[PDB]
């Protein structure tokens, strides 16, 4: 909502941390 450009997704390195998210998605996404 804020006028700031920041609403765009965090700088790509901080996306690297987002990979730390999906890796948890990599487990939960399916039962063995």
* Ordered DSSP codes for 1-32: --SSGGGSPPPHHHHHHHHHHHHHHHHHTS--
Q: What is the CA radius of gyration of the chain?
A: 14
State both tokens at 19: 């990979």
Q: Looking at 1-32, which runs of residues are DSSP E strands?
A: none
Q: What is the C-alpha to C-alpha distance for residues 25 and 28, in angstroms, rounded to an integer?
A: 5
Q: Smallest Cα–Cα separation from 9: which of 1, 22, 18?
A: 18
Give dist(CA 30, CA 2) in Å, integer: 37
Taking a C-beta distance cutoff of 8 angstroms, is the pair 15, 9 a contact? yes
| Separation CA 30–CA 11 (nearest Å) | 29
């Amino acid at each position: 909502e804020s006028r700031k450009g920041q609403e765009r997704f965090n700088r790509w390195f901080l996306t690297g941390m987002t990979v730390a998210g999906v890796v948890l998605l990599g487990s939960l996404f399916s039962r063995k």
